Amino acid sequence: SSVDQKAISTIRLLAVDAVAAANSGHPGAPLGLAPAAHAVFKKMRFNPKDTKWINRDRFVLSNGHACALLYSMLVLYGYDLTVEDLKKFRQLGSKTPGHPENTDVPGAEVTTGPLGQGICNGVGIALAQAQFAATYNKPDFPISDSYTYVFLGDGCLMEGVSSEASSLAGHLQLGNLIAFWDDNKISIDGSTEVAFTEDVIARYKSYGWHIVEVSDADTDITAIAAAIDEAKKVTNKPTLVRLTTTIGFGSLAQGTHGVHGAPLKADDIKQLKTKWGFNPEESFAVPAEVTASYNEHVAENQKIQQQWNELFAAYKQKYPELGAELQRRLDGKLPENWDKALPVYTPADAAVATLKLSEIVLSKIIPEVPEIIGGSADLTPSNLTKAKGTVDFQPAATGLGDYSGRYIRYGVREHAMGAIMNGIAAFGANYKNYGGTFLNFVSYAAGAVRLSALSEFPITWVATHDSIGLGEDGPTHQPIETLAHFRATPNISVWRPADGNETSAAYKSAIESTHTPHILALTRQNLPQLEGSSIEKASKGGYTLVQQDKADIIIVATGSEVSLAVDALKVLEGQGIKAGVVSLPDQLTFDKQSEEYKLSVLPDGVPILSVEVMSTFGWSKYSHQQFGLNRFGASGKAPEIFKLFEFTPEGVAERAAKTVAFYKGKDVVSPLRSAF
Amino acid sequence: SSVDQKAISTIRLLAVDAVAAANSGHPGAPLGLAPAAHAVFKKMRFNPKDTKWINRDRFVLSNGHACALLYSMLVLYGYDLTVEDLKKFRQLGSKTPGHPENTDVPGAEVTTGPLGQGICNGVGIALAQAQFAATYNKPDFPISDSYTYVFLGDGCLMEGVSSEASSLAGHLQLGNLIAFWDDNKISIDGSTEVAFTEDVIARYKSYGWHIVEVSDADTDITAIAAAIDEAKKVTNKPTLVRLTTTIGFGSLAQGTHGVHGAPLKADDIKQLKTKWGFNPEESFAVPAEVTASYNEHVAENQKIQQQWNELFAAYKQKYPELGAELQRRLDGKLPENWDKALPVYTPADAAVATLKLSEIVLSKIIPEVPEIIGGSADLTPSNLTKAKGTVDFQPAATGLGDYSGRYIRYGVREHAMGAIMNGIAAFGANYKNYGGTFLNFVSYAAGAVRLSALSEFPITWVATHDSIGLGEDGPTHQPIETLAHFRATPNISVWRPADGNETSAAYKSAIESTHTPHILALTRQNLPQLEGSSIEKASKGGYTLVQQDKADIIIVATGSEVSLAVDALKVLEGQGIKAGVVSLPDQLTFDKQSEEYKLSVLPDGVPILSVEVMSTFGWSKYSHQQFGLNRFGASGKAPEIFKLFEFTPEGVAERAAKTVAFYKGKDVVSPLRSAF
Ligand SMILES: Cc1ncc(C[n+]2csc(CCOP(=O)(O)OP(=O)(O)O)c2C)c(N)n1
Numbered sequence A, B: 001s002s003v004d005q006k007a008i009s010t011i012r013l014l015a016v017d018a019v020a021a022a023n024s025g026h027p028g029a030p031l032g033l034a035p036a037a038h039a040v041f042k043k044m045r046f047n048p049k050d051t052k053w054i055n056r057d058r059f060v061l062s063n064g065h066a067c068a069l070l071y072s073m074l075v076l077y078g079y080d081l082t083v084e085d086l087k088k089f090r091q092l093g094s095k096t097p098g099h100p101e102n103t104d105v106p107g108a109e110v111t112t113g114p115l116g117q118g119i120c121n122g123v124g125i126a127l128a129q130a131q132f133a134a135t136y137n138k139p140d141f142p143i144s145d146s147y148t149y150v151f152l153g154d155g156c157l158m159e160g161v162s163s164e165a166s167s168l169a170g171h172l173q174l175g176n177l178i179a180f181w182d183d184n185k186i187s188i189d190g191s192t193e194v195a196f197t198e199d200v201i202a203r204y205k206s207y208g209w210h211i212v213e214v215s216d217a218d219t220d221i222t223a224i225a226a227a228i229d230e231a232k233k234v235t236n237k238p239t240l241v242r243l244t245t246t247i248g249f250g251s252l253a254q255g256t257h258g259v260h261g262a263p264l265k266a267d268d269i270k271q272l273k274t275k276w277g278f279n280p281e282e283s284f285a286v287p288a289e290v291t292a293s294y295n296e297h298v299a300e301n302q303k304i305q306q307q308w309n310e311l312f313a314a315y316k317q318k319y320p321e322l323g324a325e326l327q328r329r330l331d332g333k334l335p336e337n338w339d340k341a342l343p344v345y346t347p348a349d350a351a352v353a354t355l356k357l358s359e360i361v362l363s364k365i366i367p368e369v370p371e372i373i374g375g376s377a378d379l380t381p382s383n384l385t386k387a388k389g390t391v392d393f394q395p396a397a398t399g400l401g402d403y404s405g406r407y408i409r410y411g412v413r414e415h416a417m418g419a420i421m422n423g424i425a426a427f428g429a430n431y432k433n434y435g436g437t438f439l440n441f442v443s444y445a446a447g448a449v450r451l452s453a454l455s456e457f458p459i460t461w462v463a464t465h466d467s468i469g470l471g472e473d474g475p476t477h478q479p480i481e482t483l484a485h486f487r488a489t490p491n492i493s494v495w496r497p498a499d500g501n502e503t504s505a506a507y508k509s510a511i512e513s514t515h516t517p518h519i520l521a522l523t524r525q526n527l528p529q530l531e532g533s534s535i536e537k538a539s540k541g542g543y544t545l546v547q548q549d550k551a552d553i554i555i556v557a558t559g560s561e562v563s564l565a566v567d568a569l570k571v572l573e574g575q576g577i578k579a580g581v582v583s584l585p586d587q588l589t590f591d592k593q594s595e596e597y598k599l600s601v602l603p604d605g606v607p608i609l610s611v612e613v614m615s616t617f618g619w620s621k622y623s624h625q626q627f628g629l630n631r632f633g634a635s636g637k638a639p640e641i642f643k644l645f646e647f648t649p650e651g652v653a654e655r656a657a658k659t660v661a662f663y664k665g666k667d668v669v670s671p672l673r674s675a676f
């Protein structure tokens, strides 16, 4: 008889009807988690009319297949999502896709569905909130005091990425994070008894999490609310709330794996409706008493945001500098002329490894841009990712840092680092955050990297030791396929800078980015400062480094192979062959230039040879012939590896001469040309 | 004064001298783990003169950067690895690469170095041993009773893949597995206090592992041996032995992160040698008392193998059928004419999804080929990877299966499944093992997949839901980059079969493979049986499906797009354009054919258009123009997605007609031609 009971029924039946309309999707977890969703959203502070309010509590559905539940909450609370949108669940072009997308769904903080990701994103949102609060809060000014609420299931708990992030979140004492395990004993294959018998609670205690168990989460919303209150009292541990639920609660098939991921039968939906007091002939029913009850909570939350806006106005009066910084960040704007801090080099400067140039850039721009934070996956002395004079992000209680710190010790946790970076970006406030590892092990985090791209998050991988140039660690460490993989992923900027100026351009792009993740492929070995490079020119993604009006061939190269191309040009000169050189530090940035610009760099009428010491995949977009490395590497001194594979001035010159011969007497059009 | 002490010193100094000769590598963990390595190898049964003895104990160095330790053991025990090879540590072309490679190093069971992988490989070796023993052991015939010993460090314990595999190994009660944690409190960034403060022991107990703690693993080899004995008494739990060690034990820099990954200073090496009784002027010292002591253990082990060979001879007398099966498997040979079990289709048969065709193949070949085992990462009802009438691999104690079972419930653990598959292959005995998930989430396991390729292991991914064809789950589930990523990786066979006959060819390749991992990209949606397909023709990787002697264009396609290409051919016919069709179910298999065969499929003098509903990367090897999908997908009904992106007979025909126009009046040579 209570409106709470009616709301829970409404949520359950909206979710079931959405799945029924699509004849596709997942009704089980929505039915089991509706009580908890109702309780959690009633405790959350949010404004459906301002999804960007920086002191909102955040909600993350890590078990993203359950998104009919999320969409039902967003509709009932009056986000920019309607019952008509629910009726278009899983339909082409709708705002209710089969897994939630932050780019398409108002109130979806992150893109989830791939299991394990959301809980790690929640760790990142909570990490950002802690850093943000430590940076801006003052006595009598709680600018940031929000919580991060995550729903997750058994699948998320089995995925290693969540173990990584949970270990780290416990270490970081993130008391702002409250996660809820849907303990329903069912996965796709059937009972969890067949593959998942670990003592989850004991594991989470071993990470340093607090635990609250709710033995009847099907009905006991008082206990769920009390569990949230208890979690909030434990300020130095993230909390896991165990929700013991019946998957598909109410269905004839409740408590079975069949209700996990298929639409319910028509008669099942009828009996669900009738026993909960709804009309079995009606779909998408919304009792006005439910939206009125919810509208009241919205009104209270809107009053809280109104007061927060006055708090912020008073803060800007008392702390004009910090307040202006905060306003700028909330407006999405970097500091004026921040890029004047970028290092600039000339050909008179010494050769430097681009991982070391990266260290230098970070040391200059971190002091100038407070919204840069980042870390490394236990490779700080090798990636060179920490700026001297910064403090690590740690709980002060440890003595090892502070929450105001700017450098994160991720440990050996590449995948969670990638998904945590997504959460930090998702927090907002213009965070431009980065994560260091060896390029070859960015691949450990592929699940998260592709979601950076799909989510349009401006995260940055500082991906060092990019090739066989690293030498002795050998083929287990040497990328071959890696750049092809990420360049083939839509919306990833993959920078491979050749020298100091190009490394500054790469960081200019990565930090200015608002919608595109970056991977910066950086060398262990020293590279010369190039004649002809500049930040301005490299900012175009691809540019003419050596212009040769009478070119017999153009060599297009990236990174460490640009200097090699220039040396090959000198060899070719002695053989009577004139070459130009194009440097292509980022293929995506280049692709986005005008057709006329791109054709000025890669014109018609001249054969083009690409040179890059890894896969030739993708390179036929830019070249007629490709010199790359399509086998695994080798353990040895790097110069000897390059000699073995003929990535030498003479070996490049030989293949350039063969390319010129191949096209002798034939017209050649730019590789940029296509039939459609 | 004991020879044990002298052996430990010898091991330590061989490792340090190897690193010193290379001026590259990792001396710290070798110094800390030499006592444990000495103790473990003394308990292990192995034959340095027969690295394939199927009842050997296996050793895995998961902390593979410590490989100077492994190489020192292999040299001292008289494997096909010498002191001269140690002097060439980390040098181009040596048998002592900077991380161990099973393809290059005698006695290296797997390729390790990428952290977390080795312990998961050990779980797989132990899983295979349990299955193998349950299949072949009889009363009085312990054909298989070997153990799997793994060394791992803090890094491995932080990588999520090891959590996945450890949860599963505990569930599977793998009492044959004994792992050793190098608890030295140091990672690359410094103390583990900065990022890794979890209660490891409590976590491993939560998985159901047994624990033995060795508080002084720097010196107490009696306690290490006793820990092994204790582990062997606990037959229903894998055991974690906590080795509390001093990283770099003996170095002036012992117990610091500087000794982790850089050569020791010359004076440090001198004082190490002098205080342990060695000559500081001598490198690569091997006291004859150490190799004599080790040679005795080898002799005992060789006697054990000699007896095992007689046991096996007696087994073949008593159980001629099982014995002949076992002999065949140990010879590396599949059953005679096993491939007669492969299903064959004609164009009169119904349309079938290739994931369903895969189910049918498995149902026919699993009964015929006992060395096939496999599983799914909690997608069994969606991948269709279990053959009816088989039992799950589980401990009998659970009631859910038996160790003789053939179907593995991996849970939602793609990355560990990939690395466990590598371990099962590494066990030997001709295991041909497979793992099912959605293609898009094979990417979660990229770290392990690339090691399958580098290790030359014939594992198979059953990778369903391969494209936008899956429909409503949307872009979080729909591959775009995935095939490009794995095709760009050396030595991966990436099959994308178009119909029944091609799906049988893909399995023929995957099961016959001895050195090449396979990924089978399979559809959710139904595809027609093609006129012109056959197992024989598809076994060539690429073949002419529709031969058109007067072709204006050839359309080359894979998988679901072959039928689309054939329908486009019909549209083109009405526009006066003659097309041929090539089906390219595996690019690697095709690439390995003769140049004349490849040119017969992709000849000179005709424009070639590729069609595949994902990245166009790689396709310029085979086509002049490429029609693919280089943006993310969409949540909707699959046919509507295909229409939106113009993957329709008319849309393909339009781009084919534009391709013909583009080359009108120009000579065209095969894309297979290259200048070098
Ligand atoms: C990384 C990843 N692996 C596999 C899947 C496929 N998948 C979707 S739901 C699911 C089962 C999820 O189980 P659980 O999280 O317990 O959800 P519940 O059945 O309780 O609703 C699986 C294996 C996925 N979406 N992401």
Ligand SMILES: Cc1ncc(C[n+]2csc(CCOP(=O)(O)OP(=O)(O)O)c2C)c(N)n1
Pocket: A377, A378, A379, A412, A441, A444, B028, B029, B063, B065, B113, B114, B115, B116, B152, B153, B154, B155, B156, B159, B182, B184, B186, B187, B188, B247, B260
């Ligand atoms: C997946 C992966 N991430 C990072 C690295 C780089 N790396 C090599 S060793 C190492 C530290 C390993 O620490 P630990 O395993 O504790 O070895 P120890 O310092 O005790 O010798 C790291 C981060 C790697 N090899 N593989």
Ligand SMILES: O=C(CO)[C@@H](O)[C@H](O)[C@H](O)COP(=O)(O)O
Pocket: A381, A382, A473, A524, B064, B065, B113, B114, B188, B261
């Ligand atoms: O990953 C590893 C070991 O698996 C190595 O790379 C070292 O641990 C260290 O990172 C050496 O790298 P450099 O900084 O000397 O190039």
Ligand SMILES: O=C(CO)[C@@H](O)[C@H](O)[C@H](O)COP(=O)(O)O
Pocket: A064, A065, A113, A114, A188, A261, B381, B382, B473, B524
């Ligand atoms: O992964 C998911 C949810 O994240 C879905 O794919 C379902 O869990 C199920 O696998 C449906 O797939 P179908 O078998 O109906 O195609």
Ligand SMILES: [Ca+2]
Pocket: A153, A154, A155, A182, A183, A184, A185, A186, A187
């Ligand atoms: Ca579940």
Ligand SMILES: [Ca+2]
Pocket: B153, B154, B155, B182, B183, B184, B185, B186, B187
């Ligand atoms: Ca360590």
